[PDB]
């Protein structure tokens, strides 16, 4: 049972708690070929049949590149203190390496100015998956040179925006950019090769480290973070095999990123099984990867239930999907189970020395539209109540949970799922570009408005 | 293999050549304005190419081309078949023309002229500018129009000197091998993408023919196809219907539109709903008349019916080899499949003059004694040229023959491991060594053109 009474729920949060809404550049911007933007690997992935539902693409999206003032006005009306957004590398350095696109920088310059004027805090993500297509020539993330391209891109953005940005994250979800994109073939560039994935793994960890150094060198005032979909790993049974399975799944899906960044090492059992196939790790890599961060971002939606897979010749971590425990599912099919969020954060703060935590993404897919000038999305409202409940519990128990960004300000391009899957607090009619604040959004606004106190 | 007796089986004006492709030999992948091709991306992402081999070095031809031309001249080979790198000419696919790129081929073509070497250029031999992948590569119709402009750009500069041009080399590879089987760049395995690539390459061929004739009307225009010699596993009804389905899919998909102005009926029945839009004028554009056509032949395609539930058209599976002779890449040697193939094609379609634009064999032996003993290559050539001479005697319009690899080179997904050259290349020293097969081929080709002399 949720609870949902906002006035009560609001009492459970400290006065300086940060409430936000989140978007990503490719998902909402459109204007793919204007002001010097060159193609990203997602433009390619969309336009090649077989990868994205309906062959949907980012050409128009929410037209946010043009309508951004309205959107910031909306965040202002909702009384949301913070906006988490991503910056398009294809706009800043269209070829990945090469000339800087001054018009690219100009746009986010204005965007940040726009937020500053409205008293909206800025949480920027440098990389939320739109890698300049040209970088695939050298091998993309499988090439170490791509990390150096990112390095220069980060130093460029932070030099321009560092005097106003409230916070910066290097990467959004290495798990997706790494395994889902290079091992499972589901996200761009759509590869299914362990050697390629391991290369991407290390080079993205490396690029993060280069990114930290770059930010601090040109904008040392801005708190630097990293955003991770750490998976709440839950065994199917308490059998010895399933417990061991959950630990391996943890090392592979979480440790591959958390241990290098926060412990300056890769997980030992993972190295045993997969080490021989990694690219060169240079003497100074791990110490660069493991620089101290001022904050970190957690993205969470649903647990990762695993069982052992004893199949002959199963690759590490040799696990398979266990069935859902809750009956409740979102429209995209993900199990709804709030307490996995609690145990996830506990495990992480026991296992790693972590800085302040912001819940950088939390939300649900529910595809109801506009009937009677209102969007009736009670199951989404329920979701936020139930999960914010857990976040308040974490605050009570002493964890340094400093903020929460509701995932998806508005409906947008949902990657492989195209425009089919809505995650927004605000409905978008893609034929008129009209924004309609959903009922869940009215609720979240009623909660967020009372902060700061 | 007596080369004198074999030489006599050919007409005096028969054309002997050696063949090459831009990405396989050139190197200099980042020089003079060249942007990446889909094959640079393909090579450099682990899992696609043996050893992760790439085209960066290759045979360093971009730097050593005059020496390689002198080599062709010294061999006595009259013709040179090569491809032009689109990534050097219009590096983003669309976008600004790169003059440095054009100059290189301009100077190459001048070098062929000065040496008396006839030029048979291939506009597209698989090196698509990576940027075009932004719109969906060959799955986007726009890519055909980019080619069209590329085609026109090249022929405007080179058309006053080129002896001949082919639009595309092997639609089958660029279409099915690249978009359905995932073996070649860009490495897709999707029928919808492959069908889009199929029509868009056919269409691009047509645009190319018109573009070339618009700016260089005198230049003979062709298309190079690895037409598959489809042989059934048995004469069973199921196997023979399968061979015909296979012919339609692997050959008909390209031969029918180009030479009959229609797609194969049964194939349209199984797959047409998943094809891209065929605009009103498309098929007439595709089926413009050609002055010649190139056949690439290596080995037969033996097939059997596959009754597996839901097996997609053409619903066939590989059948086993009849000969037990195989090249080092694993391809059956079976020369008579060349004869039956050519005769099938000429009965089935109305075709212009034929050149064998590729024929050769993978054998990986290297330099020992300062010499390369590649008898199986030589044996392969003598036997296949015999077949070509049989086709001549039977009255088939066989005008010329190009040996498959002037030199060992980057062999696509196989990297540098699989050698096809008449000339051995040591990739550390870049030293060219003429193999024994090369000596033999030079001996044969040197007698042509036979020239005006008496008889008795
Ligand atoms: O549904 C997935 C949503 O959460 C993901 O973790 C991504 O960070 C976000 O872009 C996406 O839309
Ligand atoms: O092995 C295949 C060889 O034949 C194919 O016909 C190609 O056109 C050539 O580039 C390749 O090297």
UniProtKB/TrEMBL annotation, chain B:
Catalysis: reaction(s): Hydrolysis of terminal, non-reducing beta-D-glucosyl residues with release of beta-D-glucose
Top-rank EC class of the record's enzyme: hydrolase
Source organism (scientific name): Agrobacterium tumefaciens A6
Listed Pfam families: Glyco_hydro_1 (PF00232)
Record's protein name: Beta-glucosidase
Keywords associated with the record: Carbohydrate metabolism, Cellulose degradation, Glycosidase, Hydrolase, Polysaccharide degradation
EC number: 3.2.1.21
Single annotated GO MF: beta-glucosidase activity
InterPro entries registered for this protein in UniProt: GH (IPR017853), GH_1_N_CS (IPR033132), Glyco_hydro_1 (IPR001360), Glyco_hydro_1_AS (IPR018120), Glyco_hydro_1_beta-glucosidase (IPR017736)
PANTHER family (alphabetical): GLYCOSYL HYDROLASE (PTHR10353), LP05116P (PTHR10353:SF36)
Active site residues of this protein: 170, 358
Residues engaged in binding substrate: 24, 125, 169, 298, 404, 411-412
Family statement drawn from the similarity comment of this UniProt entry: Belongs to the glycosyl hydrolase 1 family.
